[PDB]
Subunit: 298 residues, 4 copies
Amino acid sequence: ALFTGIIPPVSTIFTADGQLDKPGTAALIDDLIKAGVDGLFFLGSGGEFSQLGAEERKAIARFAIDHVDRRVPVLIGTGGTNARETIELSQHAQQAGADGIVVINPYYWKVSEANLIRYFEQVADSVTLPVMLYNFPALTGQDLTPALVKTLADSRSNIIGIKDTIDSVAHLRSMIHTVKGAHPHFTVLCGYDDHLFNTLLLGGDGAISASGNFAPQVSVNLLKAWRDGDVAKAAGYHQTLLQIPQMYQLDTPFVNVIKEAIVLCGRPVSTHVLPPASPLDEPRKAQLKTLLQQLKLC
Amino acid sequence: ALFTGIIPPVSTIFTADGQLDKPGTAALIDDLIKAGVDGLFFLGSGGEFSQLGAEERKAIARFAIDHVDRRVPVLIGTGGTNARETIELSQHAQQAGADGIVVINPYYWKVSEANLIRYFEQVADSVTLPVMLYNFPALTGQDLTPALVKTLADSRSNIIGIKDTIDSVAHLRSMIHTVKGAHPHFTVLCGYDDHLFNTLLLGGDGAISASGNFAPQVSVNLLKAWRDGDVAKAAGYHQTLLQIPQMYQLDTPFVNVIKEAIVLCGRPVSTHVLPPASPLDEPRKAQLKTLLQQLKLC
Amino acid sequence: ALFTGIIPPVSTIFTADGQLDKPGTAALIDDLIKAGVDGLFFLGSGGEFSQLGAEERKAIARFAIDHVDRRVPVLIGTGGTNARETIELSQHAQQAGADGIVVINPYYWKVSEANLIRYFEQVADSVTLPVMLYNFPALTGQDLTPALVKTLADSRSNIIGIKDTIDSVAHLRSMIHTVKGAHPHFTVLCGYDDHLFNTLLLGGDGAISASGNFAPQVSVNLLKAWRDGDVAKAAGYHQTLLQIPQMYQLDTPFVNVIKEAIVLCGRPVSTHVLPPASPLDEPRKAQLKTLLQQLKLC
Amino acid sequence: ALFTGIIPPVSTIFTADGQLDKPGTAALIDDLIKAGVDGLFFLGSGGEFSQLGAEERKAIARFAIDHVDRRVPVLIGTGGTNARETIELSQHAQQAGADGIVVINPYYWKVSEANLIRYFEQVADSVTLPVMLYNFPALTGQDLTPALVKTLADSRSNIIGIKDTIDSVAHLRSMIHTVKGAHPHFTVLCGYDDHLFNTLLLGGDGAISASGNFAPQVSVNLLKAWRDGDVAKAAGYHQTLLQIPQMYQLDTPFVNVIKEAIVLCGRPVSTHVLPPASPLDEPRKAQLKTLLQQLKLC
Ligand SMILES: O=C[C@@H](O)CO
Ligand SMILES: O=C[C@@H](O)CO
Ligand SMILES: O=C[C@@H](O)CO
Ligand SMILES: O=C[C@@H](O)CO
Ligand SMILES: [Mg+2]
Ligand SMILES: [Mg+2]
Ligand SMILES: [Mg+2]
Ligand SMILES: [Mg+2]
């Protein structure tokens, strides 16, 4: 199974003038590697892919891949609505040295099932890399159902996992039973911090969740305890992860919150975000701070 | 805090001719008491309240209350769309000796917030019993938001808990923070089996969930392990409860499934259900059987 | 085609204690007949079926049928969640002299398609009357799709029409093409005032809409003009119907608004509504009055 | 009031390699102008903006503006998720000679109301052109409510209209009453063919709808008849517009259907569409042909 364990959706650090902040993004990457994560995912939702132009995404991917320098597996988010662009970004990712790509369903038009399957098959045909699907129905307005995902896995042998981003135990359960029941090495990662523990107990593989950026140790330690058979210890970490998603209510998009949390938890990066996100206000920064303090994360 | 712990939504047993089956309902009640449940809830969703007429509901409630004979706390579900009937059923419950009532929001019209608050205040004023709210937005089409529930708890001191029936960690978390933060003894019970563990870890109080009927021991033992501080053991039980809700996909309504599971797990009752539910077919009964066998529950 | 044209969902008039107000209900009935409606529908949504007990519904139906005394066709709404009660209320309606029944899908559980089909077939088989389906997905949470309605019409020859209560030209169009295409004499009536004209232009049959109660002449004259081939005149009436539904925003449920409008338009009936509806406040009554005045309806 | 009347969302014609087909696009533009439309809108949903790259969008806009050569007002769709790009594309439009821009809400993240308002203010402040809002909640997952639109119009005097793309009479009515009530010259255009007649009768201003591409004469003649006071004639054209949208069910996205209809109605342009749209199959092309024949459009 590929891309299992804890794989953060890394925040992209920008300067106050809105350019890629290489020193800060590099420092964040190095913090996460040092924390023991199993991989890194750039240009996810929290990486601001949807607020970046294609050339910007290419430049950020190349930078990140080269900085990681093969220390851990690297995933690049290459999706969008422009399918020709998805292919271009995906081929660019493979040429630049990525280990895999992560592809959401098109999220403007909710295309027909025939078109959706074709789209994923075309993207998967365009690269030799492993492809992770990305389900985020709250934002896309179109669910990647366990049945559909199984059909995709049956069709292309490089479609090998999913980031299932949904506050639903039923969806994670059914994804695992349906897809992993046919393809035991297909990877199921939850996209929310508070579903990691359940995902493992259900027979899934890990998480790609925003708290990976500012508190990776919580998820890394949970996974380690689980793998060591220390369930009580894993449940302890889980109690923390259950509470963390309160912070994401502070703003929408909450990409600002995540970067403010990176700062609060001890890595001083520019927290600039791209429009239509905006800077978190001071009152809400203090609220975030009190949450992190109550959970003992700063 | 009232009505905490494991409180099954007890199935109502009917004969093949569609009458209350007293010996079978009584035997089920006695099994659940013997299993160590903290209470019993009659005429919930799984108790078929919505397929019963008012006079039938009164007769069932009286019978159940009388059979239980104060061995454990008894809740009666008294809700519907007809608010005058809600009041009648609730006063009847109090006269018959119930310990509390459980009241869903009206689920045909999704009434204005002013009307909704007024409805609950009137119902709560009609009895001196404790009132548990019932949130089931997938069926009602109107969520009881944590803010609203807090407003209700602030308004009437007998509105003392909620059965929050939703596959959402965020909803449970927020219900607990918002309502229990203002009213530390307000009771938050989850309505789905696979959220019991998380509900406890989040600072909530228990569950009213269908598996209480046929595998009460799993929830009772989880709660006991949690109260004893043996979190690993509680997590073990949780791994089971994570899987159980697959069975509910076998039919809709799944009241048939629950009764078939009672039979398969060792209590031979008539499994008749009221229309528009219908008998579970033999293939799906076998499927249910294989599910219960895999989880070691029969 | 049965039950075509303008058929108001007649308001049920109550005294302050919530009992049937026979003189007021009768006067309303006579006003509508005198206005030239094609039929009358009692115990629809606007008739407060869902806030009335089964015995109450039977008394109201008997009264209404008897008062109408065969002057126009009479439809009784017999639906709910309790399917045994549906059958009882439907057989009661037939015995009491109703010309047809109107049956909504169960709206607590959204039952499986197999259960839903079986429900409607059983209800249709319980009577020898014509049966009109009732679609109100905003309230029921489960759409009766054109495909499903076609399947029902294909299955039972007494399932002969629908009240399609949705603000959707596409839904009405597709209902008409899919069902009337297979069953040219199946009756399609929209449930909203502002869709009557389009319904007629699409090949449908009329409307069961709330403004039937207080401004029947608008819909009756629209229909007459359309049948006489005076499309410009019909469009003139449509311009009024397009505006009327603003008033329904004044409260939820808006059964109060409709009765207040009956009073304002010249018929002094009690405006009492059953809980959890409540009286319309004086400021909103004055707003309703201004709107009616601007549309030249009082 | 600006940009009133019939303004087609013009299809973008491509060669097989997915590049702009200048002769075919120009011919289409000339056909529409000759048909008497009041304006032209490029790079709307039907113009495939969300499957085009930013440089491609700029090239298309420039070409279209230039070909139109001020014969009618020109709108350019400049929206997306990347707000910096929205500003670039909007300023580019103004520099290229557009008369106005059309901006949808960001449709990946459904951003907070504060962020949404700020977004629209920033885009409006980036140009001195008139700005038309674009509401398409079926695709965006976030409705621009009449209250929000009013707040935007109150805030910026160059936010001067909306393409309200929704199958809802209530939404159009309320948009008109709430926004035009406060801003009588704010332009309200429906985005669907079957809502033009109602939109005019409600006090709105026209339509930007896909049938503008292949049957502009229907909407142009409807509008002329309405302005001339010949309501019966207008209603006759409406009967045709009521039926046209059945064709859009032939695929999703239906940008293919629209181009095939342009061909079938007598203008031979390439029907190539960008992925993830795909070619319409021959059976569905024949079905489309039969429909157009039945409505007397080819
Ligand atoms: O992946 C989704 C994130 O926002 C939550 O961790
Ligand atoms: O009683 C609630 C049902 O959803 C079963 O858990
Ligand atoms: O019939 C539907 C009601 O909501 C009023 O038209
Ligand atoms: O504007 C939206 C179009 O597809 C409908 O005409
Ligand atoms: Mg993220
Ligand atoms: Mg239940
Ligand atoms: Mg009504
Ligand atoms: Mg279009």
